[PDB]
Amino acid sequence: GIFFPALEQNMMGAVLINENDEVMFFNPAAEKLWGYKREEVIGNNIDMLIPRDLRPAHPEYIRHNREGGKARVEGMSAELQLEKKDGSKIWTRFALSKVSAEGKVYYLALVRDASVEMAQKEQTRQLIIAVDHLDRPVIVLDPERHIVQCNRAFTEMFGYCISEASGMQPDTLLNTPEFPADNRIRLQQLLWKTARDQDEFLLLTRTGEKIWIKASISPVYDVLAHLQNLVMTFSDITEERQIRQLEGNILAAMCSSPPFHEMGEIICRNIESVLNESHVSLFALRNGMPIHWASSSHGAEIQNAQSWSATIRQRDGAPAGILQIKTSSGAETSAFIERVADISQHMAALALEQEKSRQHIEQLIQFDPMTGLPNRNNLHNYLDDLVDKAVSPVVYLIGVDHIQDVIDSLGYAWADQALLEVVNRFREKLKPDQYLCRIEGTQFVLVSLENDVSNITQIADELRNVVSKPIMIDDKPFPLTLSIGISYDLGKNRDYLLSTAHNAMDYIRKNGGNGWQFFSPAMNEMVKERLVLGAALKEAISNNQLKLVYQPQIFAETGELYGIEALARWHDPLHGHVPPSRFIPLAEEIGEIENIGRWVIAEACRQLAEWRSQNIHIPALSVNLSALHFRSNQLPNQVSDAMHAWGIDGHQLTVEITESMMMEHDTEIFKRIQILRDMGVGLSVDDFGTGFSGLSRLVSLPVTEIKIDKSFVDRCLTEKRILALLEAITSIGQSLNLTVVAEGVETKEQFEMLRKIHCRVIQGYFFSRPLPAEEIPGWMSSVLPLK
Amino acid sequence: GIFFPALEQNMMGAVLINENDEVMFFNPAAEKLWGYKREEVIGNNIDMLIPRDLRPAHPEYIRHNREGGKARVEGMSAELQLEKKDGSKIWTRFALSKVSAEGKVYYLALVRDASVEMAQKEQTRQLIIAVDHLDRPVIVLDPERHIVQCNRAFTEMFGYCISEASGMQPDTLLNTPEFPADNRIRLQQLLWKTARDQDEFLLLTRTGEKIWIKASISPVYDVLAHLQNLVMTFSDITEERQIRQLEGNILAAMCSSPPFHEMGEIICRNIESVLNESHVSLFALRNGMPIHWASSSHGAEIQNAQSWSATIRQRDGAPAGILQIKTSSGAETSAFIERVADISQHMAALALEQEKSRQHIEQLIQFDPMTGLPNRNNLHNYLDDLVDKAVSPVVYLIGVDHIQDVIDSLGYAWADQALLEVVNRFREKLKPDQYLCRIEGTQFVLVSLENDVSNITQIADELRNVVSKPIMIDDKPFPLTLSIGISYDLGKNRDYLLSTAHNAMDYIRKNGGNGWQFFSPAMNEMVKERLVLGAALKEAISNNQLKLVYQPQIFAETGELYGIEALARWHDPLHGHVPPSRFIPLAEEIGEIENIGRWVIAEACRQLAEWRSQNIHIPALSVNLSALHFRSNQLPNQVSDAMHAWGIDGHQLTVEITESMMMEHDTEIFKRIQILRDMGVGLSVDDFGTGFSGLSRLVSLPVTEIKIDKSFVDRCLTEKRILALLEAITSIGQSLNLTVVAEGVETKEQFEMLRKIHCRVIQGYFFSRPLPAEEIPGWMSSVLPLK
Numbered sequence A, B: 001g002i003f004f005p006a007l008e009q010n011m012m013g014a015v016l017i018n019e020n021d022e023v024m025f026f027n028p029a030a031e032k033l034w035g036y037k038r039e040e041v042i043g044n045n046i047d048m049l050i051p052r053d054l055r056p057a058h059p060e061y062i063r064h065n066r067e068g069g070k071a072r073v074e075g076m077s078a079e080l081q082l083e084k085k086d087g088s089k090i091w092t093r094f095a096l097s098k099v100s101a102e103g104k105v106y107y108l109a110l111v112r113d114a115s116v117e118m119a120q121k122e123q124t125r126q127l128i129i130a131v132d133h134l135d136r137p138v139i140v141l142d143p144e145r146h147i148v149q150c151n152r153a154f155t156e157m158f159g160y161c162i163s164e165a166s167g168m169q170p171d172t173l174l175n176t177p178e179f180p181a182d183n184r185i186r187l188q189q190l191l192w193k194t195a196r197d198q199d200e201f202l203l204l205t206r207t208g209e210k211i212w213i214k215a216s217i218s219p220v221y222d223v224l225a226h227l228q229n230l231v232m233t234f235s236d237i238t239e240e241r242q243i244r245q246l247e248g249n250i251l252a253a254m255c256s257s258p259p260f261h262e263m264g265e266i267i268c269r270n271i272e273s274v275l276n277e278s279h280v281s282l283f284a285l286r287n288g289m290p291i292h293w294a295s296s297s298h299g300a301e302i303q304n305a306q307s308w309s310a311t312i313r314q315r316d317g318a319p320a321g322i323l324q325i326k327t328s329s330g331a332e333t334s335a336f337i338e339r340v341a342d343i344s345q346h347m348a349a350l351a352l353e354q355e356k357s358r359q360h361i362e363q364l365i366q367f368d369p370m371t372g373l374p375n376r377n378n379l380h381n382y383l384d385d386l387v388d389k390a391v392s393p394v395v396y397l398i399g400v401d402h403i404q405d406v407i408d409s410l411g412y413a414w415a416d417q418a419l420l421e422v423v424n425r426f427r428e429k430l431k432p433d434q435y436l437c438r439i440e441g442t443q444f445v446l447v448s449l450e451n452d453v454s455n456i457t458q459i460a461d462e463l464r465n466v467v468s469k470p471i472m473i474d475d476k477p478f479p480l481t482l483s484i485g486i487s488y489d490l491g492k493n494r495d496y497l498l499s500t501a502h503n504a505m506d507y508i509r510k511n512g513g514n515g516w517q518f519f520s521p522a523m524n525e526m527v528k529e530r531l532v533l534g535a536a537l538k539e540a541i542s543n544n545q546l547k548l549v550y551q552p553q554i555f556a557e558t559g560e561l562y563g564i565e566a567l568a569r570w571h572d573p574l575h576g577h578v579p580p581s582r583f584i585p586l587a588e589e590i591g592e593i594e595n596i597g598r599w600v601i602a603e604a605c606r607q608l609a610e611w612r613s614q615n616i617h618i619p620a621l622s623v624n625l626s627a628l629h630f631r632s633n634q635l636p637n638q639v640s641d642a643m644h645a646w647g648i649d650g651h652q653l654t655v656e657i658t659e660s661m662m663m664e665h666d667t668e669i670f671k672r673i674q675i676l677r678d679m680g681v682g683l684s685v686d687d688f689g690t691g692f693s694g695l696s697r698l699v700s701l702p703v704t705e706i707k708i709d710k711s712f713v714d715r716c717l718t719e720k721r722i723l724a725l726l727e728a729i730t731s732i733g734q735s736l737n738l739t740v741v742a743e744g745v746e747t748k749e750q751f752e753m754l755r756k757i758h759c760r761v762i763q764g765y766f767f768s769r770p771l772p773a774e775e776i777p778g779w780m781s782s783v784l785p786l787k
């Protein structure tokens, strides 16, 4: 047989044993494997080749195998420790063969030196230990981008093992959630990058949780500079992204320069959002003492909690503050607490140097570096100057509320721009004698010098409705609102005024939303009374409870009634008699002048209808109209309706407009005046505030009557210089066909002094007090003529 | 036998080839590796067993080995690929033996399925790559207390390789090379005795520099819970503190909101300081084109520069930039490089997101967040709207020079306060029609609608003069100065207007500032002509080069001279005759009105004395004065001097004022007028801008003459309505003893139509043109009376 020399020249070792456990063959490699010799071993027992641990208990195994008769020798199949002659224990791999030759059971063993293979196995055991020890998910991929090796951290975080996660792309079994736009494409693209790269993904666990991971792919090239493998390292970056969101939010705050305490609050809120059910406290070092900058309002008690304190230092190393975080022990990892506290320490450190720089310069600066408005110090100086000069100012604290919506929808920058738009609206509606300043954030001060409650109410209404129009920000409306606190005393102090106005403003802010309120509710009950009176006036106008009273006008010489003026009256069961000189400005403020005009015109035409049905001539009726009633582009329609519904065509009706209308210069108003005058209804102008150039323009824009006011007729007695007004106006009267109507006559001397200038018509108490309609005909039929 | 059946049932596959290279042996072990059976391999050639890619190459090796005749075949000692019957390939390990018996040479090839062994080797290679990509130094220690396996980070941060550190231990002997650290006994005995230990060392490197390293040690137990292995992970405390400090410093720099290039440079310097001897640069993507953002100015060539590139990604979406850091090879650990790259990549992502946000801020917001003023965007919109409405705007570009003085002396905060001081001054002097904007920093833009030199120069002078008083910063003056460029051209656009204004402003700034300039030629030429004309007027007034010319006023009936009016005339050799309507507004603009008033009064009194020297009665002389002349508390002094230096007491002199003076309401001016009237000098009022109430107050503050303007007298011909104006004015005249003077008569019909109203006196071209004083007595002696 040629196998004997084949085994002699072979690399393996052949040790064939006969029935009596005697070695019948010994190849040269057996000398290297055992340190023996063929002369020493051949013919002798196998006891020399067995490890000393179990030398005598091995013929028992051999004998047990001998009687079985099985073909294959399934035993002796694992790498086993073999001890040499010198005592060294190498690792060998065996391969047995039962040879039943000539009725005798032989045993052949193809021993191979498993030293190198088991050194590889020891190396891979150590590498498995080192790769499962670090808790760092690492996978390895072929050029086809399929997983070939994974680790224990990867299994822990994704729930897949080497058996399941092998041969498939790391996206087929780790598909991203429903959102398909970017995650799937980025995950598929990272796997096919030929250079070192990395990305961040949402991957799905076997159970189904959403975990943000950071995957880093790097190629490993062979000797021939060819792609051999691609290793992917996954980092669980849930906490990393939490701290990154913290960094982003603190950056967006600090770069936008927020207030000190609000910055502390947002820092604390981010820390709590990263560390659930914890307590956070933050202190600055002022004069070496702790000053409480901010802390979370969630002061829940925690048992066996750990408190980590970090000394917030300055740039040069000097201490600046203390940042203390108390949290449940074991709920959040200590190293994560360290990293969060360190990053927040740097953030709050820069915030603290900024605040320290601002601290010794805020008392010296005079302007707000944001909106360009004067600051609290400038306001204090201005108020001190006012009180020293003995002037009583009125302070409006304006709180621009509902700013948090733009804060959390757009950002601090866009919210500050909303503030700028609001203050620019304030500037465009501002007045020369008003002082505007910013005290703290959304809080402004308007210092005015208006004493009247009506003026204060009008200013408050204009301030509250300037923000009624939505604020346009990035093509997104924002309905901001104002809480106004009004403080005013005869004089107490700037501190007192500010404190009272702040009390009012915080009351309004906490008890609802937009609105304005006085301090000292004795000045708010007045507003309530005026509002209820206005509501009563509106409902009386609606329900037709108003009344008109008529005052005859007389000719100078003939003693004949030129006309009667319809003066409004009101009588409420609760308020008694409300004078026109009290409810006409109220109607102007509310917006009831239009309704009053329609009502007076309709009632006047109706009463003309009855006084024509019965035998009364009623030559002319003068109806009072205001500025808004004429500026509205509707008047001639209802005036013509009033004439043609009762046959009272305009040669009888007359309108007296305010001198403010003549002072105003509006082409549309002038055209409407001309159209009305064309219809035959007369026109009268009272008072002489408008100049004689205005009166000549009024000659151009035709009228019929000019009224001399009671304020001038009263001084006609004493001031003899104003007789020229009456004389000249009368002269214009007979020059260009105007009727002059003296008002406010009360005494015989006052009438007879105007008698010489030959005034056309006279109206006042000297001839008839305003008489009710039910006895106007009695006066007509009894008194006229008067002479 | 002991040859054939020995290897038939063996695990090792046995194949034998004879002289004719024909296979003779084949066993089930080789069947399981080739796919064939014992009916297709015996007899036929070895050609089928070879893989298809090596069939022609293989057979020469057998012949070469036969020729060589060597006993031990060193060939095929490595693993070999194997092609099965079906075409699949597996790895196998060969043991080749040659037989020289019976004069024949056979070949036996004991094959073993090296599939599992080579899978183990590939697994070991993959695990080695994975451990090298672990980002933390890891060492594995045997129970014999020595070092077995290292990492790549360990080799990078200590310089010790697997060949040097393997077998023996450079841990017990190299942990305390020169510094004992008082923990060698811990690392020797307590390290293998306790479990889960850790401490800090000063273990040295190849260089020997002292570094603080963590030595976290954990034991790995076997099934018997015995000390199978240990693992020690290292972490450089210096590296950890440096990587925390890098993040802190970068975040602090980013919190200061620096420019984009400065932020890139700051990241560059921080990365270089963390990694000395490095060239670092950043690029930011722009529409897919990577542009240069920042780079390290140290351009010295770096030897063996390994470059690490990182791809910036925002919170979600496409890449935003690149960051490349090239450092000398071996300078720092790859894990250190990767950590620095990751931190700086997230920092650069934050910086790019912040710059995108700032681009949105500069692109959409219409207000500057430092002064509350509109920015260049609002300026563009306003000018575009105006030019689309086709109204020509006038643009002023103002620059506040000399700001570096405040910046250096008091810092940036007080420079900010100075800019807000100037902006508040602009706002205080601002007019409702004007629009104010802040294009950038030192510069501002004011947009107006008035377009004429007399107003442009005035508003530019006001803007330049608003900074006459130094800005009070911390009780310290600072004299800032203004450079203004003015642009106005009909029909042009905002780009042209802004460019021209900036050209003018830049030119004046380069020339030295402290002033303003128009764009384009002939505009500054008109300005210079006006300036030289004003200087000539000033010197002519000083040197008494002006003259007076007198226009007689006649009575309606008697044809007697009521008075003459003194009208200023000037004859300059260069400018010829300069009309009063041309040089009086110039005097108002410059400030020569007072000098003109003194000269006119003095010369009028001198000519009155000269005429009194001979036989001239000259009942009255009228002298024109302006508003600014009477607003100073000096008028009565020189007027009384003029009367009493020539005996021309005010019963002959007369003063006519502007209607704007009576429009104004000043108690001091009224008292001065009353005092002057008490001296006997008359007063006259021209034009009828003031109202009739103003005329009655004028009667209260007595006057003497009312003049009907030529503008009204001309329209008296056509507009028949304004006859009432004259009638009423004359009526007031005879009512309260005023003289009415009708100006600007030209025709006999114009005279006769005003005759019927009985106007007191008439002045115009119908009776006498303005005559020089040298022949005025000739007119007196030859013309009067006129009738």
Ligand SMILES: Nc1nc2c(ncn2[C@@H]2O[C@@H]3COP(=O)(O)O[C@H]4[C@@H](O)[C@H](n5cnc6c(=O)[nH]c(N)nc65)O[C@@H]4COP(=O)(O)O[C@H]3[C@H]2O)c(=O)[nH]1
Pocket (backbone or CB within 6 Å): A566, A567, A568, A579, A580, A581, A584, A596, A600, A624, A625, A626, A743, A744, A745, A746, A763, A764, A765, A766, A770
């Ligand atoms: N002491 C005194 N007073 C005299 C004398 N002659 C008339 N009066 C008063 O003068 C007022 C006439 O209305 P007015 O002067 O246009 O001033 C009116 C007018 O401006 C307004 N007003 C009155 N009625 C209306 C109306 O229907 N509509 C509107 N829009 N305003 C009205 O209310 C003002 C006050 O009206 P009244 O309270 O009725 O006060 C009446 C009347 O009582 C007199 O010899 N002595």
Ligand SMILES: Nc1nc2c(ncn2[C@@H]2O[C@@H]3COP(=O)(O)O[C@H]4[C@@H](O)[C@H](n5cnc6c(=O)[nH]c(N)nc65)O[C@@H]4COP(=O)(O)O[C@H]3[C@H]2O)c(=O)[nH]1
Pocket (backbone or CB within 6 Å): B551, B566, B567, B568, B569, B579, B580, B581, B584, B596, B600, B624, B625, B626, B710, B743, B744, B745, B746, B763, B764, B765, B766, B770
């Ligand atoms: N076409 C025409 N013109 C007539 C007629 N009658 C008079 N004039 C002119 O009308 C002007 C009247 O001067 P003014 O209206 O007071 O307005 C004066 C006055 O405001 C100003 N002015 C003239 N002299 C003086 C002066 O000495 N001092 C001051 N402060 N202003 C003066 O210059 C203005 C222009 O006066 P002049 O150009 O000198 O022209 C004079 C006079 O010559 C007439 O029938 N037809």
Ligand code: HEM
Pocket (backbone or CB within 6 Å): A015, A016, A017, A049, A050, A051, A058, A061, A062, A064, A065, A073, A074, A075, A076, A080, A081, A082, A083, A096, A107, A108, A109
């Ligand atoms: C380092 C050297 C050796 C070690 C560690 C060793 C140990 C073992 C072990 C563990 C078994 C299996 C026991 C069982 O399955 O219960 C076995 C069985 C056996 N050994 Fe060894 N032995 C060694 C040397 C040898 C040699 C040189 C031969 C030469 C013929 C041999 C012949 C056998 C036979 C025939 C069996 C019976 C296998 C069976 O019953 O399945 N042994 N020995």
Ligand code: HEM
Pocket (backbone or CB within 6 Å): B015, B016, B017, B049, B050, B051, B054, B058, B061, B062, B064, B065, B073, B074, B075, B076, B077, B080, B081, B082, B083, B107, B108, B109
């Ligand atoms: C998949 C199967 C086989 C492959 C891939 C293969 C390939 C090779 C290679 C690469 C060598 C050169 C090795 C070196 O230079 O280090 C070689 C040599 C040789 N092979 Fe093969 N072979 C295969 C099968 C066989 C078989 C089955 C036999 C004999 C039964 C054989 C006999 C030889 C001989 C005699 C040499 C000469 C070695 C020397 O002279 O040093 N080969 N073969």
Ligand SMILES: [Mg+2]
Pocket (backbone or CB within 6 Å): A565, A624, A656, A686
């Ligand atoms: Mg009335």
Ligand SMILES: [Mg+2]
Pocket (backbone or CB within 6 Å): A686, A709, A710, A743
């Ligand atoms: Mg009245």
Ligand SMILES: [Mg+2]
Pocket (backbone or CB within 6 Å): B624, B656, B686
């Ligand atoms: Mg004049």
Ligand SMILES: [Mg+2]
Pocket (backbone or CB within 6 Å): B686, B687, B709, B710
């Ligand atoms: Mg004039």
